[PDB]
Design a protein around this ligand. Sequence first.
Ligand code: LMT
Lengths: 51, 50
Amino acid sequence: MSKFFIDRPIFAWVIALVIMLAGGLSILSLPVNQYPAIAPPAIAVQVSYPG
Amino acid sequence: DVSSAIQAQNVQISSGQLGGLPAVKGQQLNATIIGKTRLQTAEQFENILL
Ligand SMILES: CCCCCCCCCCCCO[C@@H]1O[C@H](CO)[C@@H](O[C@H]2O[C@H](CO)[C@@H](O)[C@H](O)[C@H]2O)[C@H](O)[C@H]1O
């Protein structure tokens, strides 16, 4: 490439613009939060034997 | 008769709570009351009035 793209900077831009366009529209639908799920799964069992 | 006897005589006394909520102003001592569990020994069983 490079040499190819040096005489084709519209094409160069377009691969850049597609990448930006794709990644942009993604920022619109990503979950946001402080941290990822970083906690061990725990399952809890409960019963009360009255008194 | 024996079955019924054992069923009435080999049970757990359910047991409440001294100073259970709601309680009256004062209370102060809140403690669980534990009753009797159940027969354990073969003897305890040989007992039980029929
Ligand atoms: C973990 C997943 C990662 C996936 C992402 C993969 C992408 C990696 C990109 C590497 C591709 C690079 O491709 C690169 O093209 C340029 C085009 O100018 C070339 O660039 C240069 O190469 C040689 C070395 O001086 C010269 O003879 C040539 O004149 C020059 O153009 C390279 O020979 C080539 O290596």
